[PDB]
């Protein structure tokens, strides 16, 4: 019936049925969990006690995380008339007696997530891992902050709740390895992006400074780098350069060539770089992901043999396909599958005795048969082959960005807080008031969660920028809205654009070579697979 | 990776030990609990926390330790 519970000692051929299973769907056991010799000790019962109760540990992460939109604002505590809504949102505000029966319940199911692998790691294997030293420190922040929120700076609660939520969900922690491997490439091409705007704002400073453009908008070199930054984005487009155009028609040729270069060469050759360093970092992760299951297939091999010499016999192979509980008959497998091995030793007439023989054997079975069964349109195809593939294949590359917009919201709730008021006077002349944005706001956490969406789409993105630079008075409010741009021209060109290209080229490959392999041979080849993936 | 002249080694807490002995080194104990074959059992092993009790009994030594691929003898 059920083969999940077997930390209670299985046979030497029956303890194989998990480690050979855990290479198929790619799960992970800890290299410390495999570090013990038996691999059936108390360190293995207490990993299957995790991944079975693993829904109390992942839906807690949203009970943790979505307490941010259901918080208060940071700062109606100084201010006057909260309950009169000065353009605020819609959600309720949890009171302090409602944030204590919801931060203890969140922090009763988070220490039990963090101080659980002490039931399968030691007092010193645990504390030397640094995606584990952090997540103990993040909780002691939340345990200090619950202590502070019980008996009474800038309140770094809601940044930790993102950071726990990144480290806890595996794929967001795995995505963030790419972005920290991609980052040294991206800051170079960012450092040549700035040199495009720094140069082209200097000629635009120089050329227009006497005339009617460079007295109206292009006043000084600060407000031409600033304007020519927003023309890079295209979103500022004729409104920058009308009073150069109205006075000489020839100055469009500067500006119809700058935004020609700025969008079609440079923006694509930021996209081409960030898609070049996505190809390298992804396959660097797949080759770090292969060994997470290839180590399994040296722990699979290394329980079959008795004396550890490095061999399997032929009947010793056949005795384990019955342990697979997948295929019906015994002798029709190895008589067929050894021919399916491209490089068989044939040292004996029966056995093939190497460890890299078995390392691809137990992976070829999981593709051809697919018969485990645990009891417990042609014209529009290649698009929706990809469009259905992509909905869980971008949830780690669109959950990083949602955890970048949940950092900037919490910054933006605090840097730009209850400022757009209906009591305010310097508000009502900005572009927020005339376009009537005047919501899309930054006062609540889901007022400003949506505002960052509009800034992310880049639909009229400078209305918020040019209006918050006037409400805070500085020029330093600019830097919130330039840094959002830069990170999400990594993130919205890396993790989203460059992925949807190479995800189309794989549901191109599973449609083009499906016709080719249907006419090439009767069964699966392993050398065409190794050559076809090394082409696009 | 430090020996001690009943022989001990140092420092990967319980399964990071091979224990060896004109001659090339002959292996004696893998894991400091498992006598390798062909050899009399007057040499035994024991993991004692952060010490590795390699063991002389009868009268008639290059302990080993890795973590991932880099391996640390004694001397």
């Amino acid at each position, epitope marked *: 019936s059920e083969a999940i519970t077997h930390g209670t000692p299985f046979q030497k051929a029956a303890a194989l049925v998990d480690l050979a299973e855990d290479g198929i769907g790619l799960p992970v056991e800890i290299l410390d969990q495999s570090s013990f010799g038996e691999s059936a000790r108390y360190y293995f019962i207490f990993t299957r006690l995790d991944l079975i109760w693993s829904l109390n540990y992942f839906a807690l992460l949203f009970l943790n995380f979505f307490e941010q939109p259901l918080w208060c604002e940071k700062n109606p505590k100084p201010s006057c008339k909260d309950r009169d809504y000065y353009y605020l949102g819609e959600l309720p505000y949890l009171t302090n007696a409602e944030s204590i029966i919801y931060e203890v319940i969140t922090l009763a199911i988070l220490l039990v997530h963090t101080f659980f692998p002490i039931s399968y790691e030691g007092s010193r294997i645990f504390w030397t891992s640094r995606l584990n030293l952090v997540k103990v420190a993040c909780v002691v922040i939340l345990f200090v902050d619950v202590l502070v929120d019980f008996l009474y700076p800038f309140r770094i609660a809601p940044y930790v709740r993102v950071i726990i939520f990144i480290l806890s969900i595996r794929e967001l922690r795995d995505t963030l390895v790419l972005l920290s491997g991609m980052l040294g490439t991206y800051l170079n091409i960012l450092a040549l992006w700035m040199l495009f705007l720094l140069f082209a704002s200097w000629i635009a400073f120089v050329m227009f400074e006497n005339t009617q453009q460079g007295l109206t908008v292009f006043t000084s070199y600060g407000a031409t780098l600033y304007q020519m930054f927003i023309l890079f984005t295209t979103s500022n487009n004729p409104d920058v350069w009308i009073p150069a155009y109205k006075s000489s028609r020839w100055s469009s040729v500067f500006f119809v060539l700058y935004v020609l270069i700025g969008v079609y060469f440079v923006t694509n050759l930021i996209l081409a770089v960030v898609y070049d360093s996505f190809k390298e970092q992804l396959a660097k992760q797949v080759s770090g992901m292969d060994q997470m299951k290839r180590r399994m297939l*040296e722990k699979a*091999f290394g329980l079959i043999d008795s004396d550890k*010499n490095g061999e399997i016999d032929k009947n010793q192979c056949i005795k384990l396909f019955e342990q697979l509980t997948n295929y019906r008959t015994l002798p029709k497998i190895s008589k067929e599958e050894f021919g399916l091995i491209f490089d068989e030793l044939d040292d004996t007439r029966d056995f093939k*005795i*190497n460890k890299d023989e078995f390392a691809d054997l137990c992976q070829a079975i999981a593709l051809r048969f697919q018969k485990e069964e645990v009891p417990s349109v042609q014209r529009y195809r290649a698009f929706i082959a990809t469009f259905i593939t992509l909905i869980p294949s971008l949830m780690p590359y669109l959950g990083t960005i949602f955890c970048v917009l949940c950092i900037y919201c919490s910054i933006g709730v605090q840097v730009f807080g209850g400022l757009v008021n209906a009591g305010n006077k310097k508000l009502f002349e900005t572009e927020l008031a005339e376009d009537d944005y005047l919501l899309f706001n930054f006062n609540d956490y889901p007022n400003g969660m949506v505002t960052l969406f509009n800034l992310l789409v880049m639909g009229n993105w400078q209305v918020w920028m040019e209006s918050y630079k006037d409400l805070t008075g500085t020029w330093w409010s600019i830097t919130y809205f330039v840094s959002f741009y830069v990170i999400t021209i990594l993130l919205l060109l890396n993790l989203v654009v460059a992925f949807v290209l190479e995800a189309f080229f794989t549901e191109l490959d599973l449609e083009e070579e499906e016709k080719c392999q249907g006419q090439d041979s009767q069964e699966k080849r392993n050398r065409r697979r190794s050559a076809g993936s090394k082409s696009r | 990776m430090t020996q001690s002249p009943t022989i001990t080694c140092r420092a990967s807490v319980s399964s990071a030990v091979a224990w060896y002995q004109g001659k090339a080194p*002959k292996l004696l104990i893998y894991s400091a609990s498992s006598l390798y074959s062909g050899v009399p059992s007057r040499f035994s092993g024991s993991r004692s926390g952060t010490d590795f009790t390699l063991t002389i009994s009868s009268l008639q030594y290059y302990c080993q330790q890795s973590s991932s*691929s880099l391996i640390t003898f004694g001397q």
Partner: nanobody
Amino acid sequence: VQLVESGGGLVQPGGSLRLSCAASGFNVYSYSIHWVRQAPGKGLEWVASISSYYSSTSYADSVKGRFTISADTSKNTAYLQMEDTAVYYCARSYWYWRTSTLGGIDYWGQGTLV
């Protein structure tokens, strides 16, 4: 079956040699190789490892980048491109990742004088 090292000639400083680690007991992919040496009077020293299984050819701290290792599965030979006044040995751990504990390094070579 047991190990054969070759390539250990008479080396001058400056230039270097290229070793080889011959084998007949299926000693790549399964039983992978380790280069460990010993300068005279000293203890041993690990100088190069390899997986022909995992495709990882990794080696030490004090020789990192100096000494290059490669293989030949078809003749079961582990090459090694090279105060190195040493006596080189080969080795056959069954394990690769943590071969300290459970593999050991089972079969040691015959010896050389580099």
